[PDB]
Design a binder for this molecule. Sequence first.
Ligand SMILES: CCCCCCCCCCCCCCCCCC(=O)OC[C@H](COP(=O)([O-])OCC[N+](C)(C)C)OC(=O)CCCCCCCCCCCCCCCCC
Ligand SMILES: CCCCCCCCCCCCCCCCCC(=O)OC[C@H](COP(=O)(O)OCCN)OC(=O)CCCCCCCCCCCCCCCCC
Ligand SMILES: CCCCCCCCCCCCCCCCCC(=O)OC[C@H](COP(=O)(O)OCCN)OC(=O)CCCCCCCCCCCCCCCCC
Ligand SMILES: CCCCCCCCCCCCCCCCCC(=O)OC[C@H](COP(=O)(O)OCCN)OC(=O)CCCCCCCCCCCCCCCCC
Ligand SMILES: COC(=O)C1=C(C)NC(C)=C([N+](=O)[O-])[C@@H]1c1ccccc1C(F)(F)F
Ligand SMILES: [Ca+2]
Lengths: 100, 295, 49, 819, 48
Amino acid sequence: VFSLGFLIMGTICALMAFRKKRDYLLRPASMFYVFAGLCLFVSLEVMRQSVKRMIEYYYSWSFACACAAFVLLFLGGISLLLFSLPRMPQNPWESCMDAE
Amino acid sequence: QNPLRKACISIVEWKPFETIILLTIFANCVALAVYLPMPEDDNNSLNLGLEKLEYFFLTVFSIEAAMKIIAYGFLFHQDAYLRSGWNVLDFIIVFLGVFTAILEQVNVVKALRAFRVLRPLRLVSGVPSLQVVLNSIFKAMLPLFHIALLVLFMVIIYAIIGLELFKGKMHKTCYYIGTDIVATVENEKPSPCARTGSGRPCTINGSECRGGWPGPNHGITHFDNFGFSMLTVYQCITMEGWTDVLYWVNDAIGNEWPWIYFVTLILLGSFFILNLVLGVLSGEFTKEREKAKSR
Amino acid sequence: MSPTEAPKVRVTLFCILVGIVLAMTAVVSDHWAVLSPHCEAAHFGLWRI
Amino acid sequence: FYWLVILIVALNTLSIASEHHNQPLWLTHLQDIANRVLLSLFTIEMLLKMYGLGLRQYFMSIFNRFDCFVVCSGILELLLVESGAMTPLGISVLRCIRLLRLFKITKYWTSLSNLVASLLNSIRSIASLLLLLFLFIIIFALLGMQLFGGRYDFEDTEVRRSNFDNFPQALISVFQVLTGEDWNSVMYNGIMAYGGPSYPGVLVCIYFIILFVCGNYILLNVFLAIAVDNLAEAESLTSAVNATWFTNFILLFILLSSAALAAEDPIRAESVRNQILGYFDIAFTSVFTVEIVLKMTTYGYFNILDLLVVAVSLISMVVKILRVLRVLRPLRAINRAKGLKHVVQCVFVAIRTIGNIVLVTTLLQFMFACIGVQLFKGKFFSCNDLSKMTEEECRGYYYVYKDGDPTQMELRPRQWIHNDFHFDNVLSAMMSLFTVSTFEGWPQLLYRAIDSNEEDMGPVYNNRVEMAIFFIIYIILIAFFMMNIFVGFVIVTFQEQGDKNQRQCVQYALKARPLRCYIPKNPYQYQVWYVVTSSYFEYLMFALIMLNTICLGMQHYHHISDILNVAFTIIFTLEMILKLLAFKARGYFGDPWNVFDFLIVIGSIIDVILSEIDTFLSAFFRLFRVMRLIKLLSRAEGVRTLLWTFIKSFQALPYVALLIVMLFFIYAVIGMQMFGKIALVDGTQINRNNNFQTFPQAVLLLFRCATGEAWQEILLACSYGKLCDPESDYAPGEEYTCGTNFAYYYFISFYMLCAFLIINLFVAVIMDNFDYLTRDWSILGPHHLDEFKAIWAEYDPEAKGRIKHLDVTLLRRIQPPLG
Amino acid sequence: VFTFSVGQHNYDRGPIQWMACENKGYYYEIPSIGAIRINTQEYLDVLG
Ligand SMILES: CCCCCCCCCCCCCCCCCC(=O)OC[C@H](COP(=O)([O-])OCC[N+](C)(C)C)OC(=O)CCCCCCCCCCCCCCCCC
Ligand SMILES: CCCCCCCCCCCCCCCCCC(=O)OC[C@H](COP(=O)(O)OCCN)OC(=O)CCCCCCCCCCCCCCCCC
Ligand SMILES: CCCCCCCCCCCCCCCCCC(=O)OC[C@H](COP(=O)(O)OCCN)OC(=O)CCCCCCCCCCCCCCCCC
Ligand SMILES: CCCCCCCCCCCCCCCCCC(=O)OC[C@H](COP(=O)(O)OCCN)OC(=O)CCCCCCCCCCCCCCCCC
Ligand SMILES: COC(=O)C1=C(C)NC(C)=C([N+](=O)[O-])[C@@H]1c1ccccc1C(F)(F)F
Ligand SMILES: [Ca+2]
């Protein structure tokens, strides 16, 4: 439930940022997606110990679904961040937190 | 300061007293090195002689101080002597010397004999060349400040991370059943264990995983509080036996996650910081050379 | 538009959208665990089995 | 004569470098009469060239000043054995002088004589800064004789050879702790000598923390103020299909064939993963077998590389070399990767530079190998139990006592065991010296050499304590000196492909652009902005962070550790919302440090929520409260500068790190194939934690050997004697057949390469920033111009171009170096 | 006088051998636990 909540909150900022030249709003939303993934991950953790606290077993369809979803969200949020954050300066006159 | 009332000893101060004090300190060093430390308070004849030789080396270094403290001012008269850089170090040596050799003759402890190992430093005050060299390697570390301040906080951050994650985990091991003899094999150092977990389970025949074991290296390598976590992190940073800590954490809590902690501690802490230090020093050697070649 | 309507932002948000759809579909689906002490194969979910 | 003389010296070298242990008698004869003829041949050399180049020009030049000493000693040593020279140890050093005669002749070459005018002057000018380093070691030897001298009185039977019992031993121990090798074992002996891991006992960690930190720092001003001064002046004196749609996809199809090569199963010869990977095998062969035609029928060194890669992959649809020769799939990347060609070429032409100093170290290491054979040949045998001293006595069984208890014993067959890194022939001596040079397990060899008794006899505790010098001079030359002028070589060489100030200043002032500041209207929140950026508030939040850290450390093993986290989480989230009430959420995320704090406040919230949900009815979310103290870094402007200067340069030279990654990949796959069927037995070095079964385990093992963990014990853990894994497919009774002697080539090569690349990688990153390091902060620099930008943006909050004329007052907010 | 020099150390052993040889006795060395049995029963050769 918490992960879905983060997905909804991140989608809010993601939609309301393509318009009005509110570009900066890609910075919060991104991390929301990140956190989304993270929570799904710990769900896996929980599920893992569950399948061990009970015999043969098998992770078949939605465990790979969740693993992939978490990895997608995680890498995608970190990449959205590093694509929104301006740049590693790379020149003594270049500088973060600058004009345009 | 005062007139030439007592200062009838500064006459010799400029004689070849270089050799007479250099050789005296050199013989003091040699007499410090032939001493042979015996356990549990034994002794031998020779050691009992090299103490009857310490009042001969603690007299010369005291009269060659009372010969200079009355040949310059009341003590210094301008903050000269004790504010002279090195002559105060010699004075502190002759201060602790007689202080400790007198405090020992009062309760007729031995830890006070450990300030006796500074007397070799009066050799660096002896010659001037070593004075200017020891003043270079102290000036080459004015630039190494920020790197040390960046290492002191990486060690502090990794100590706290390991204190969060691996605190109190390496405390069970494979004992023999119903016994206090830890079970190992020929070349295996006693590593942690796990009963009903992800760590490694006991495979020696008659062995059980049980708690109440102090820790891996006789109780020294573990993240049980901040001091010990700092100690073990600093030991992994110097890249000595970091794989032992990794393998013990693996054997305790599981195989898949812990490497992130150590592989990253060795990349950042060791390789990156060493790179920084090499860069900052050569960038200071080449600068001083480009300035001193211009002479 | 340089950090908003350049290509790399759009492809990355497509990645995000696939992640979102996989996440919204991997929650209510009871498709990731089984058990049989051993023909009684149980099947897990997130709420009920 | 310039080549007959070297034929002579080569015959003498080969006569000295064939003395092994238990040589045939005819080899002894061949040697004892092959030096005699060359001694009688070097006798006339100081009589003929005393006649051709005059007579008095034999002494005014340093070169041939000793060739008379060669024979003066030769004759002297030729008539001493047959008079009184007993003590084969003393006779063994008589043959050492012989080695010296070979050295003078070998040295001739311009490259091998131009450097002693620099190397010898390096040592001889800086032999005073060596004195302070020797005095450091002499003070710490005495301090160790005080603290731990005679306190190793442990009532067990474990041998602790590195103690502080007398002066030579304390000197050895302090030296070993300086080189870093196993200093932790010495520390544990020191901590157990005192109480234990209790309060007063652990405080003797300090002796080993100051001796290793302050002692390895004088070794940076000693052996590396030589190769920055006395190697820079030496060279200064010598001065006097063409689309992005297909090629950029076929490149991407090498990164898939390679990852399919990685995740294989070396144990089970036929698995589902191997059955599944066998289809990607044919796919990734076929594509490149049908992509050579498009690139060679349309066209006329690098593509033959690809064709060989695909040929070996086709003949694989003994034969086992076919699967090792296919691992050079990641090397056709240099074919299409243009960005990586220019770094591999610098690596190729960085080698013409090191052939003059890399050949002087191998000859220096070959000189020491023959001395080592003269000293320690045959002396490194032993018995299981140290009471029997010859091979005729070391037969039968004997008792060992577990825990050192005379009532708990076990029978063991006793055997005459030879050491693993011995000194019998010069190849074995060279291997041993190699492992000593990398500092690994050198005290084990030292003590095996201090106890060396006689030619076929076992060790005698503390017999020859002066044999330490052999190991301590070697280490001082090779590992500490040549390994430092070689790095100085690389550094001053990169100094050439890498005035100034006016240039950089005029480029700064021309390219730079002023800043944003997000200053608000609407005084209601201007009030809150006035405090947010007050020094009071900033210098309060740092205090709160320090107190949070101190609360985080106070915890220990065996609640308050949670409520205080709730409190600090609240205090920080309130500062975040209180700053959003000021920067309008638009000027807030404009600052990266603010995004980073916003990333931590959420993590802390989730942390506390997960804790309380667990208690109401994720062990890694706890790292968010810890990372809070990393944002102490927005203020340490010096440290942040120093971090950015190097991150910008690691983000600029990634193609060199790609070399290291490819090296690890190739070697991990090769090793996964070669020694991957060995059994995981505990008590060895191929065990559950360090093995070659899977790909991550192999890469972790390689990373362990790069750091210089006991890589020679891993080397010995796989060499044709090794019990095979049970799940492997192998003939019955063919158990002790896993492992290969290829190991000796595998590890020795890897180490060298990986020691090379890393050094390369260090100096690039260093030289890339050589402006920042070699900089004066007193005359000028980009910091002054950055401060000018600061005072500008103070008056022009938003950029919006440039500002009005007067408010010309700023010359009062300007430092004198600028105005 | 039978003198036994026990352990593995560096202290001088001249005087102890002299004590053993000057007094019609014998001199034994015990470096480990394995040497104990054979070196503590071997004085019955001197006594005989
Ligand atoms: C001032 C300058 C800056 C200097 C410092 C800069 C670097 C900061 C330090 C980063 C720390 C590295 C992360 C910690 C590694 C975690 C170890 C671990 O999880 O094992 C023990 C624990 C083992 O505990 P456990 O709970 O599994 O054990 C019991 C078993 N169960 C779970 C069944 C109960 O691992 C975990 O708790 C599971 C979570 C692991 C996942 C963590 C990976 C991501 C962590 C952050 C990502 C950042 C990558 C590294 C840093 C990047 C910097 C380049
Ligand atoms: C240029 C740089 C030079 C500066 C010099 C720096 C050198 C110093 C580095 C060495 C620091 C190592 C400190 C080692 C001691 C740590 C405290 C300790 O040992 O105690 C652990 C204690 C265990 O408690 P326990 O004994 O189990 O309790 C039962 C009692 N019957 O449990 C505790 O209570 C420990 C609690 C202490 C936690 C403190 C955490 C420190 C973090 C502060 C970060 C800021 C650092 C300072 C800022 C400086 C800014 C410039
Ligand atoms: C800064 C200047 C200096 C820079 C120096 C440059 C050096 C860079 C190279 C560093 C190499 C570090 C490699 C460390 C990663 C090793 C992974 C590992 O050790 O995990 C072990 C664990 C074992 O799992 P398993 O195989 O299942 O064993 C149990 C029974 N199944 O495995 C697991 O269970 C979890 C699996 C997760 C592992 C993911 C990554 C595996 C591949 C390694 C990544 C590296 C890229 C591969 C090749 C290049 C490596 C450099
Ligand atoms: C040139 C100088 C070089 C700088 C290095 C010198 C730094 C000085 C170190 C300061 C240490 C002071 C310790 C403060 C007293 C601690 C009180 C104590 O008794 O704690 C012991 C602690 C565990 O507590 P314990 O008492 O054993 O609990 C069980 C029941 N008592 O067990 C302990 O181990 C406490 C001590 C921990 C030691 C920490 C070691 C790591 C820190 C050093 C790494 C810093 C590297 C700097 C690199 C800079 C680069 C140039
Ligand atoms: C690269 O690194 C490596 O590997 C090494 C090691 C450590 N070891 C040895 C022995 C050697 N060798 O022999 O050669 C090497 C060296 C050392 C020093 C200096 C120089 C050098 C060179 F390489 F260049 F050669
Ligand atoms: Ca090591």
